[PDB]
Design an enzyme around this catalytic site. Structure first.
Site, PDB file in Angstrom:
ATOM      1  N   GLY A  41       0.799  -1.334  -0.183  1.00 53.46           N
ATOM      2  CA  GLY A  41       0.128  -0.120   0.090  1.00 53.46           C
ATOM      3  C   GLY A  41       0.766   1.316  -0.094  1.00 53.46           C
ATOM      4  N   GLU A  53      24.088   8.766 -19.288  1.00 52.02           N
ATOM      5  CA  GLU A  53      24.755   8.005 -20.296  1.00 52.02           C
ATOM      6  C   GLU A  53      23.658   6.570 -20.699  1.00 52.02           C
ATOM      7  OE1 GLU A  53      29.527   8.034 -20.055  1.00 52.02           O
ATOM      8  OE2 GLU A  53      28.572   6.443 -21.070  1.00 52.02           O
ATOM      9  N   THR A  59       1.998 -10.761   0.565  1.00 50.51           N
ATOM     10  CA  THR A  59       1.181 -10.937   1.853  1.00 50.51           C
ATOM     11  C   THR A  59      -0.192 -10.254   1.487  1.00 50.51           C
ATOM     12  OG1 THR A  59       2.444  -8.723   2.313  1.00 50.51           O
ATOM     13  CG2 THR A  59       3.150 -10.989   3.175  1.00 50.51           C
TER      14      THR A  59
END
Ligand SMILES: Nc1nc2c(ncn2[C@@H]2O[C@H](COP(=O)(O)OP(=O)(O)OP(=O)(O)O)[C@@H](O)[C@H]2O)c(=O)[nH]1
Ligand SMILES: Nc1nc2c(ncn2[C@@H]2O[C@H](COP(=O)(O)OP(=O)(O)OP(=O)(O)O)[C@@H](O)[C@H]2O)c(=O)[nH]1
Ligand SMILES: [Ca+2]
Ligand SMILES: [Ca+2]
Ligand SMILES: [Ca+2]
Ligand SMILES: [Mg+2]
Ligand SMILES: [Mg+2]
Ligand SMILES: [Mg+2]
Lengths: 69, 439, 426
Positions: free
Chosen positions: B143, B253, B178
């Protein structure tokens, strides 16, 4: 050419500035629309439980008016 | 030429904990911040100063910020072995997490702490003579990792404009997931952030999990095992900025050589060699061997088959006992193999770099200290396989609007779910367009 | 940091809830005096979730004890841990509800509810970050069922962004002869459908059958039945009380377990259940998913699983657990909805319960839970068709329509469970 070189760096600046403003604007309305939604999602959730108190008192009122033996 | 790291959520914080531990061992910085080898006290323009600031007392302070919406994870840092390394203002914690809910991390709980995070970031930036960009570590699934990171990325685009932002993201894996709503959080963060990040390195926990079991004989890996391995990829990428050398890349780069199109900016990393100490014993691996290992799908960091796609750009970062002659021959052989296909609009498709500092292993780790190692960052169309898997899981639940109420309860509209999914639909389409041969 | 406020109403809530505090206090090394007599430091890492801290390093449960019959209160004080409870958090009534839902929700509970909320308010203000409330109570009585649901609505009113969890015990003819129990339950379900985020369904018909059929107790007592509940309650809350990262707080659990707000009625399970007159990981796994170990009287193979949370306790090979959870999921593929990927989550805690070396607790949101609500609707409509005993309720002010709405709403919930049981992926 020197005229072109100035036109180019100026474009780059205008590119960056517009990126900031489309970003700043898109974030501002999206946090505001969201505010409205969560306010209304609570405003109506507790107007849901004034109807449950206007009904809790209604029930308790119908008992005392039934106690008129 | 300076970079600021931002570690968000449990995954980002715990990854940073491993990365900064490795940086200190690579540079000889003690847990109290002292670096004896540094004779320029209080400052300097040394290569390691791009990631470390200095105080008059000789302390070397990471140019990093740790943010989580609950204090359990960052408190370990505040009391761990490396607690002295960070100034207290650098470690930021709320009191109530986002509960695996993108909306809480972005709108409800996130807005409570976003302004403070930007203020502490701005104090780090003001300590800069020139700032390259930001490195953002987080997880797609959490979250906080998804909801708050997206808010931070959007705010950073405002306060700093087009300045570089690079992500290190954790792709969900059922092995250690989870949360059931991880697909929703990943599609939403990817869409919200897609136009703000110049380059995002994804790591699939499942890929790391399988590599740790197979190559390191780890019977049941843990986040500690996985995070150290991620640190090696992060160390290799930043090695060209932290160590002084003539054959280095910088943020500008290898961005310019990996990203052909703004939205197509999701390379998958590959690291080699990943070997246990037992097998390393009496076994030294050549530049060519580790170079070939980078194109073997088994060693990838996102579950996908590059053979079933096409390469658009490869960045090979070698570190250790590596000579240019060996590197040129290895890449020369790759350009002969037909199992390795490049798009027809990328004739020159190899960015190359060498750093001469050898890889470092944290004490007590599982990786063997090797003399030479290589990290390859390849932008292949095969990465779209990862998006397809996660979009399918999004569709299965969204078809029934499963779990969507938790997000609407926090203010979001169903429109954001389709809007985000349509963006992923376009991205899946963009990855096949670029893989089509030219007219 | 993450504090939970426990509440227990009625005789059932107070007896199952009193056992809860005896069990978890032992697990954390807290003796009836509130003192810590433990060995390992994981017993206190998260002690503050359920316990306030006072001077002298004494721990007091964050509990509020409630009933409309004052005799109950003395029973708790006399219990093994009766003197650990903070005395001001006792809120007793006068007479008793007499298994009349309307009295506990509207008349005598209403006059007492405001005193309870004051204790609630005092406990909540001393929380660094309150996460929610859990209520233990029965749905067949009059106080836990009627006043319990009222206290839920009033707490949600004053703390609308905190999670409301309940352990609701469900009437059974096998355990109590009271005739109006179907009325009270159907009326409370109508409330719990709207005002709780997650509800552990404890069914006495399942507890009795387990005590009789499995434990061979020909005459089970509430002490036997409540021994089952305490084991379940300890298991389904261990993610909240010990270090871990799966469903570690009440909201993270809700978000993984509640795909739709009304379908928040869980099917608890425990394993092993062995008689005193008579264990491997594969066995634990098979037993959890057996119907005979469910604390709700429903067969999960008569429906589909929307979401499942399995908790393993004890010292064991985590690799062995991963394989067996994978095995049981794909050997029983047909019993898990295909449109919620990865809907089975597994947590492991090193500390086992008392008396065992390996335990497994099961939390399942199954569409088979509709069998329970169909039992009650059958009993409820059996008496409502004839309006038997209905004068007990209208006499307190209720109307006959509140009964039909509660009946219809429960029937809608059953119909909703079937809608998603029959849903397809494509
Ligand atoms: N590689 C790695 N992945 C992790 C780690 N911790 C969590 N994850 C992954 O992150 C995802 C869950 O997000 P978290 O980081 O735990 O949550 P969060 O960022 O703290 O946000 P909240 O849930 O609101 O607290 C899952 O997909 C996990 O697999 C970690 O330490 N290392
Ligand atoms: N398992 C179990 N069930 C109980 C227990 N006590 C009561 N019950 C059940 O609870 C229901 C009756 O509710 P009670 O708790 O006794 O009533 P109350 O909530 O105290 O309300 P009143 O007694 O009417 O004031 C019946 O269905 C009983 O089977 C108990 O200790 N254990
Ligand atoms: Ca210096
Ligand atoms: Ca110095
Ligand atoms: Ca009995
Ligand atoms: Mg977290
Ligand atoms: Mg160079
Ligand atoms: Mg009673």
């Amino acid at each position: 050419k020197r005229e072109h070189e100035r036109e180019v760096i100026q474009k780059a600046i205008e590119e960056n500035n517009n990126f900031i403003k489309m970003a700043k604007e898109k974030l501002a309305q999206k946090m505001e629309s969201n505010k409205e939604n969560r306010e209304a999602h609570l405003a109506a959730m507790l107007e849901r439980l004034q109807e449950k108190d206007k009904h809790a008192e209604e029930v308790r009122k119908n008992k005392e008016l039934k106690e008129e033996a | 030429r300076e970079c600021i790291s931002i570690h968000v959520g449990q995954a980002g914080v715990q990854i940073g904990n491993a990365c900064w531990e490795l940086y200190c061992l690579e540079h000889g910085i003690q847990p109290d911040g002292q670096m004896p080898s540094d004779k320029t006290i209080g400052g300097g323009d040394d290569s390691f100063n791009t990631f470390f600031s200095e105080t008059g007392a000789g302390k070397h302070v990471p140019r990093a910020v740790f943010v989580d919406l609950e204090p359990t994870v960052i408190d370990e840092v505040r009391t761990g072995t490396y607690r002295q390394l960070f100034h207290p203002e650098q470690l930021i914690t709320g009191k109530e997490d986002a509960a695996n809910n993108y909306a809480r991390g972005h709108y409800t709980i996130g807005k409570e702490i976003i302004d403070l995070v930007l203020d502490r970031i701005r104090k780090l930036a003001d300590q800069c003579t020139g700032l390259q960009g930001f490195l953002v570590f987080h997880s797609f699934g959490g979250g906080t990792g998804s909801g708050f990171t997206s808010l931070l990325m959007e705010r950073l685009s405002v306060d700093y404009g087009k300045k570089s932002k690079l992500e290190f993201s954790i792709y969900p894996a059922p092995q250690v997931s989870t949360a059931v709503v991880e697909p929703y959080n990943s599609i939403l963060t990817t869409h919200t952030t897609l136009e703000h990040s110049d380059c995002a390195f994804m790591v699939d926990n499942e890929a790391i999990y399988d590599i740790c079991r197979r190559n390191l004989d780890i019977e049941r890996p843990t986040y500690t095992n996985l995070n150290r391995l991620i640190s090696q990829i992060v160390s290799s990428i930043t090695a060209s900025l932290r160590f002084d050398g003539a054959l280095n890349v910088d943020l500008t780069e290898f961005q310019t050589n990996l990203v052909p199109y703004p939205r197509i900016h999701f390379p998958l990393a590959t690291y080699a060699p990943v070997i246990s100490a037992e097998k390393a014993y009496h076994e030294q691996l050549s530049v060519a061997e580790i170079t070939n290992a980078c194109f073997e799908p088994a060693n990838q960091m996102v579950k996908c088959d590059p053979r079933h796609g096409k390469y658009m750009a490869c960045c090979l970062l070698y570190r250790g006992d590596v000579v240019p002659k060996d590197v040129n021959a290895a890449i020369a052989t790759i350009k002969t193999k037909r199992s390795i296909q490049f798009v027809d609009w990328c004739p020159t498709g190899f960015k190359v770099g060498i750093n001469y500092q050898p890889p470092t292993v944290v004490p007590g780790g599982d990786l063997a200290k090797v003399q030479r190692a290589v990290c390859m960052l390849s932008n292949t169309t095969a990465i779209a396989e990862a998006w397809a898997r996660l979009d399918h899981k999004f569709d299965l639940m969204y078809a029934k609007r499963a779990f969507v109420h938790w997000y609407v309860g926090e203010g979001m509209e169903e429109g954001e779910f389709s809007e985000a999914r349509e963006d992923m639909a376009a991205l899946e389409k963009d990855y096949e367009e670029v893989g089509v041969d030219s007219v | 940091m993450r504090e939970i406020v426990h509440i227990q109403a009625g005789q059932c809530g107070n007896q199952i809830g009193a056992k809860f505090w005896e069990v978890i206090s032992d697990e954390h090394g807290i003796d009836p005096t509130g003192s810590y007599h433990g060995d390992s430091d994981l017993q206190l890492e998260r002690i503050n979730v359920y316990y306030n801290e006072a001077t002298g390093n004494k721990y007091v449960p964050r509990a509020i004890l409630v009933d409309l019959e004052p005799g109950t209160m003395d029973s708790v004080r006399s219990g093994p841990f009766g003197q650990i409870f903070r005395p001001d958090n006792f809120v007793f009534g006068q007479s008793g509800a007499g298994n009349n839902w309307a009295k506990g929700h509207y008349t005598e509970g209403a006059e007492l509810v405001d005193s309870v909320l004051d204790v609630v308010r005092k406990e909540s203000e001393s929380c660094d970050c309150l996460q929610g409330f859990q209520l233990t109570h029965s749905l067949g009585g009059g106080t836990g069922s009627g006043m319990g649901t009222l206290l839920i609505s009033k707490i949600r009113e004053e703390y609308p962004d905190r999670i409301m969890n309940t352990f609701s015990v469900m009437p059974s003819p096998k355990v109590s002869d009271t005739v109006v129990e179907p009325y009270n339950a159907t009326l409370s379900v109508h409330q719990l459908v709207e005002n709780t985020d997650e509800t552990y369904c404890i069914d006495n018909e399942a507890l009795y059958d387990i005590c009789f059929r499995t434990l061979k107790l020909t005459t089970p007592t509430y002490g036997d039945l409540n021994h089952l509940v305490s084991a379940t309650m300890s298991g389904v809350t261990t993610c909240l009380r010990f270090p871990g990262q799966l469903n570690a707080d009440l909201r993270k659990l809700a978000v993984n377990m509640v795909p739709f707000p009304r379908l928040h009625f869980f099917m608890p399970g425990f394993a092993p259940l062995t008689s005193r007159g008579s264990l491997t990981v594969p066995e634990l796994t098979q037993q959890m998913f057996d119907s005979k170990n469910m604390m709700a009287a429903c067969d999960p193979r008569h429906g589909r699983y929307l979401t499942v949370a399995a908790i393993f306790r004890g010292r064991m090979s985590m690799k062995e657990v991963d394989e067996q959870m994978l095995n049981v999921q794909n050997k029983n593929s047909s019993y898990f909805v295909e449109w919620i990927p990865n809907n089975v989550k597994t947590a492991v805690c090193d500390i086992p319960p008392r008396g065992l070396k390996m335990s497994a607790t099961f939390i399942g949101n199954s569409t088979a839970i509709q069998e329970l609500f169909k039992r009650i609707s059958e009993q409820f409509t059996a008496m409502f068709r004839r309006k038997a005993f209905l004068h007990w309720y209208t006499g307190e002010g209720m109307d006959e329509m509140e009964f039909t709405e509660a009946e219809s709403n429960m029937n809608d919930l059953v119909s909703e469970y079937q809608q998603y049981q029959d849903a397809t992926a494509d």
